[PDB]
Amino acid sequence: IFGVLTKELLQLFEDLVYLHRRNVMGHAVEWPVVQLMSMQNLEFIEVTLLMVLTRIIAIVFFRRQELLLWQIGCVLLEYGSPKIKSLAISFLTELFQLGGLPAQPASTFFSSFLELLKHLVEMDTDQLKLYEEPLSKLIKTLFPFEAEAYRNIEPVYLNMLLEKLCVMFEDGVLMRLKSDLLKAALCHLLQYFLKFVPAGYESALQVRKVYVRNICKALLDVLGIYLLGPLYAALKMESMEIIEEIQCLWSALKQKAESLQISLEYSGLKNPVIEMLEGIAVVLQLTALCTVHCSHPSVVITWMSLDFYTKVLKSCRSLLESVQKLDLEATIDKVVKIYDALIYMQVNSSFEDHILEDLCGMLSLPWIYSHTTFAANLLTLSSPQAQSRCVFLLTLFPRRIFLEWRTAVYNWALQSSHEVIRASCVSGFFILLQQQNSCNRVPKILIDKVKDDSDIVKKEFASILGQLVCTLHGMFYLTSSLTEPFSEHGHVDLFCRNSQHECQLKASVCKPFLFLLKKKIPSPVKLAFIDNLHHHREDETDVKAVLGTLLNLMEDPDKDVRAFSGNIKHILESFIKELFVLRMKEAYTHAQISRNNELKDTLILTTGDIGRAAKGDLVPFALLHLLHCLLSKSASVSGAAYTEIRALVAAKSVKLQSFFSQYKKPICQFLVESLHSSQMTALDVAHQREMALNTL
Amino acid sequence: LVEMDTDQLKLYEEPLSKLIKTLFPFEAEAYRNIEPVYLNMLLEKLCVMFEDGVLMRLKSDLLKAALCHLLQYFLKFVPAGYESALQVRKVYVRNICKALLDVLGIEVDAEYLLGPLYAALKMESMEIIEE
Amino acid sequence: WRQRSNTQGSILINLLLKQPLIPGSSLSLCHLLSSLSALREAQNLAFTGLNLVARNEGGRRAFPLCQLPGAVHFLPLVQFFIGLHCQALQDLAAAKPEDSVCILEGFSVTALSILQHLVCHSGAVVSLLLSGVGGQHPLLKMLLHLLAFLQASVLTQCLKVLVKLAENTSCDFLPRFQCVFQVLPKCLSPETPLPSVLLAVELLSLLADHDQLAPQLCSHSEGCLLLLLYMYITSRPDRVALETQWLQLEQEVVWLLAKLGVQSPLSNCQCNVEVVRALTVMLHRQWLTVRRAPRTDQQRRTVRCLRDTVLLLHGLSQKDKLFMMHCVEVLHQFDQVMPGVSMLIRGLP
Amino acid sequence: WRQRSNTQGSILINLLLKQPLIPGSSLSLCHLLSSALREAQNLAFTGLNLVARNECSRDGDPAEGGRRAFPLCQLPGAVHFLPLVQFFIGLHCQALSVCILEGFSVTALSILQHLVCHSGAVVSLLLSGHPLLKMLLHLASVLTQCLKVLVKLAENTSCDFLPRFQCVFQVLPKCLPSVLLAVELSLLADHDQLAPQLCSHSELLLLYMYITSRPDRVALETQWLQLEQEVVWLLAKLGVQSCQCNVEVVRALTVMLHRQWLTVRRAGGPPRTDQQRRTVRCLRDTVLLLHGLSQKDLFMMHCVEVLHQFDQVMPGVSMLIRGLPDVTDCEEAALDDLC
């Protein structure tokens, strides 16, 4: 009945398209389009129709009957102007996510993308407001971040993408100022095919690499005079191409960086202070690239020299003195970030111990106190995130100069705890000594300093728990940087982010930090409360205290955070059963008092997880109690149980009926005893027996 | 070309067209005379109008005579040459043959059409020579 | 039209030009493109046809496909290649070497798939197929003979070409196509691959297009051809289909199941009983999603799949007079499905 | 231009593509492409075809200054075709079954001439060295055709840069029917500017002896006219520059001259035949040639020893020239001076 109504609706949609088609010819105009008809008014009616249509299209979901409307939609998009064209494109994009790309739209669909590429070079800012960043996101949808649709993307579509490559940055439109949402999309677009390097049989390949060199000129874009940070990741991808490919133009790019350095050389002002900072940005990425990239042969190949960089930083240090109080400020914070970048560039080893001492002075730069060659003279010479960055610079240094000072700096982080700076202190305490971590002691420090630990800081404390907690005192690397790629548009934040826990701990040894996580504790989210345990003995009563914390997890403010399931199972794999059985009985009793199915469901899932993790009969006995629940009426119960039994089998790698004899036996006798309990209080004789037989 | 110079095109009449017929493949024809690159298709864009064979539509009988010369050019086109396919010519110059029959249906005198009719005799004669 | 129309044809020519534009093909067109002499003449004609395409740039049209006498001539050259592939298929039946002859047919089949793309690109090739011997095209009839016979993937591609023709094709052309389907249902196999199964779903879309195809029905159970195919869909083993891709083939099947209900015309039917079992298999996928509790495109699809399930649930009650009885066989799954539905309600915005 | 200009270049690519492509060669050029680098070049050729599809190359290389008169299209991706051409240079390298590529290579050169028409810049790339073209200069009738493609390239080449291209050919001796077509060099005279000194010789006359020889079997009247046009180009070259060898070229001209006009008199007809029309043009050229000989000199005395035979042809020719449409008054004035 809906379909017959739909057929009438499709004819109405066709009539609106026909009115658009007459407009597309631009010649004769039909005398009647109805009522009273205005071409702009018809467009206004159409835009309202499209939003209903987008809901209708998902509802349509008709094979061989949707691409033609989508093919019509690209033509409609050409008729459409700005946002009105964009909303139709968005409706098509949602359809595109469901249908991938229609074969029939073919080149014309590519052409609609091409028209947008033509639009981007010369698009009105008001037109840009009409244009949708989400529509750009749909273009992002068109080429997958990994392979996906882009891997399946047509070679002819790839040629259209190559035409797109000529447009924008090869055009130099990308260098030209653009709306940020469009600019980010352009950076994403280079990333979608070039960064992925997906396919490319359609792509130029060695011819493409020459195009990539043209792309590199495009990559400088505004250059010395957002997406560029995305481009910087993209530039890092170009560096990644140099890595491995060199193993068996970048030097010119280094020369371009040198030219930016030359502008700094002519004057600190002559280098754009932000632009010099931008060149400094991705210098660490350059450090990650090349020899760091080779790490993850001869070493004759040289990464840009740290000493040349240090001289640039020294020029930067002079430039900060040069900057007026009105000057610098947030820009000064960026210069400090570049100094932080230099510390990241140093990575495992500082090029100069003296430079490292200079770096400790640099971390104080704007605000000091607590924990220096300059000493009083540095004070003499002349942000919550900024305080965190200063803390990070101290964090990057371990021991060495001011090793005692670093403990004092941790005290300074304790001394100021507002907003991020309170959060910054919590991060600082966790990373305060790599050496302190290697020795085994209670962490104390900030966690000892505030019982509440803040709320954002408490989330930081959970992150600290991952560094501590399950992770062992012995330290390997002592660096959390690992091999991070790009975290989307997310701020770098902590410098370092990317078998059993970390390189015996009493539950009492966990002490307060273990105490801080609680069912009573707000959580919301449990988040990193699982911490190190979630992600290299004889606890006894202390293990039971840990079990009580696990029981609070079992209550789960969030059923999804119960999270406890599986992560808890891995811990179990690494005496407990009598306590666990008691905990399960308490949970059942709590569930009965609640009389809530959803709470019961969380418990049932937990019970199933405990059985799947368990290699022992007693968890199966716990499963048998669930089977008793299966006998129980009110839904869930056995239908839930049948799924649970299959789940038990999957963990089991069970033999089915052969598994069942092992599964039953004494447990089967327990099942017979449960049937016997039904016999003890039938309250239906044979009728009671028939219900039991159905359970059987 | 059929309506490019209007009255001025009428003033050139047959002669600008006659010069074109002389210019390409005139009498001698040959692969050398006609570029492979122009191909059968460069002749073909003119040919689709020939398939219509609208001599009555054409403003000048003398212009038609240049068109009749073009039909002679089509006879020259029959032969073996680069950029020409014999099956393609039957596919192409089949509607033009229908147009010649249409000219036969309503002509007071064959005239320029009579030369086309000789052209119609040509190829039909060639089929007799082969088939 | 005008320059844009010429470009679309040129892009279609470009796809033929790429060698091998098809994956797993050393070249497409060119050496692949070329009586042996008659075939060579066709190859020369095909180059001419491409040149003709260069020379010249609502529902029945569907996506507009340019129609050219030259496009038809290129199609004829394609037909000559198809005849060589058709001759290879007859040779393979004679054969009991043969794989190399089959590889040449596969090359042509890849060429046909480019031809199928060309058919989407050009109205004229589709119209020639529509005209048939008098019906299925004699060149089309040879393709049907190939259908009667990597080769299976080529057959799926040919089915895809028919489906592309079908959106372009008139419902009457689909009726001429119909009964190819009667053999096609026999052709479809559990053994045959999931991408081929997606092509079968396209064949189901073709059945909707033709009223006689609509007349063939899942109802009448095993005796009905549709119910047996639906039962295979209901089983959803999806052994060829992998991970999300297995789900995507299932999602296409769900759209096809929805389409029959949308159609006015659409155990008395084996398929309706199978559909309750199929809903349970979808429910099992939903339960895995529920355990995950939609940043992933597949995860967004799963939310879409749950919405499809909600439409399916109204349909499932319609499918079985004993809706409760179908639930009782799938009822333990159905209780899980209700739990999944509650998770879905949280997912729904 | 854009796509419409692009199609004409694509059609040239198609002609190589068309079965047996152009000239009846079995290879489709893409078929000829069908080692690992050569396979990559074939991939590049498909990309060049893709470049042809875009029509981006057309309406490219817009400035017409210096090279090839009105500007050639950019033909971007011509270089990818050139890489395939370099692969063609690689084929048959041992020679420079056996020389199978030569026929494909000549086809590649003909395609290269179409490509040369396609891109002014592509011609510039070959001049830079391209490098394969320099190798071709370092290394039969197809080779003569390749030189003709180079001659088309010279017309494309900008002035002075073209003189550099003349410098690029290794030797004048190396430059020394199909060979006759190659003689019909003339392009360098057409590219008037530098290389006038190269045109000046040491003792040309041997070529004039070949023109007297009429060695090619076809001996086409049009072919003879083409040799006459080459002699006329040499006469134009002499004027740009500012002997007994000149008399020897004149002696070859005289053998043609006795037939000229007298053959027309035997016909007693307007020259409807294209060869007859060509002869009429040649007769006007001969009157122009006589004016050029008068400008040269001294020259008359060398002319006098063979002059009596020339005069018997000349008196009939003078009557023929006044009648001929091809004959022109400036050439006629020299004829009147002879009278």
UniProtKB/Swiss-Prot annotation, chain B:
Forms a heterodimer with ATRIP, forming the ATR-ATRIP complex. Present in a complex containing ATRIP and RPA-coated single-stranded DNA. Binds to DNA, and to UV-damaged DNA with higher affinity. Interacts with MSH2 and HDAC2. Present in a complex containing CHD4 and HDAC2. Interacts with EEF1E1, the interaction is enhanced by UV irradiation. Interacts with CLSPN and CEP164. Interacts with TELO2 and TTI1. Interacts with BCR-ABL after genotoxic stress. Interacts with UHRF2; this interaction promotes ATR activation. Belongs to the PI3/PI4-kinase family. ATM subfamily. This is Serine/threonine-protein kinase ATR. It is found in: Nucleus; Chromosome; Nucleus envelope. Ubiquitous, with highest expression in testis. It comes from the Eukaryota. Serine/threonine protein kinase which activates checkpoint signaling upon genotoxic stresses such as ionizing radiation (IR), ultraviolet light (UV), or DNA replication stalling, thereby acting as a DNA damage sensor. Recognizes the substrate consensus sequence [ST]-Q. Phosphorylates BRCA1, CHEK1, MCM2, RAD17, RBBP8, RPA2, SMC1 and p53/TP53, which collectively inhibit DNA replication and mitosis and promote DNA repair, recombination and apoptosis. Phosphorylates 'Ser-139' of histone variant H2AX at sites of DNA damage, thereby regulating DNA damage response mechanism. Phosphorylated. It is linked to Seckel syndrome 1: A rare autosomal recessive disorder characterized by proportionate dwarfism of prenatal onset associated with low birth weight, growth retardation, severe microcephaly with a bird-headed like appearance, and intellectual disability.
Swiss-Prot record, chain C:
Its main location: nucleus. The gene is ATRIP. This is ATR-interacting protein. Phosphorylated by ATR. Interacts with ATR. Heterodimer with ATR. The heterodimer binds the RPA complex and is then recruited to single-stranded DNA. Interacts with CEP164 (via N-terminus). Interacts with CINP. It is found in: Nucleus. Required for checkpoint signaling after DNA damage. Required for ATR expression, possibly by stabilizing the protein. One of its GO terms (biological process) is DNA damage checkpoint signaling. Belongs to the ATRIP family. The lineage of its organism: Eukaryota, Metazoa, Chordata, Craniata, Vertebrata.
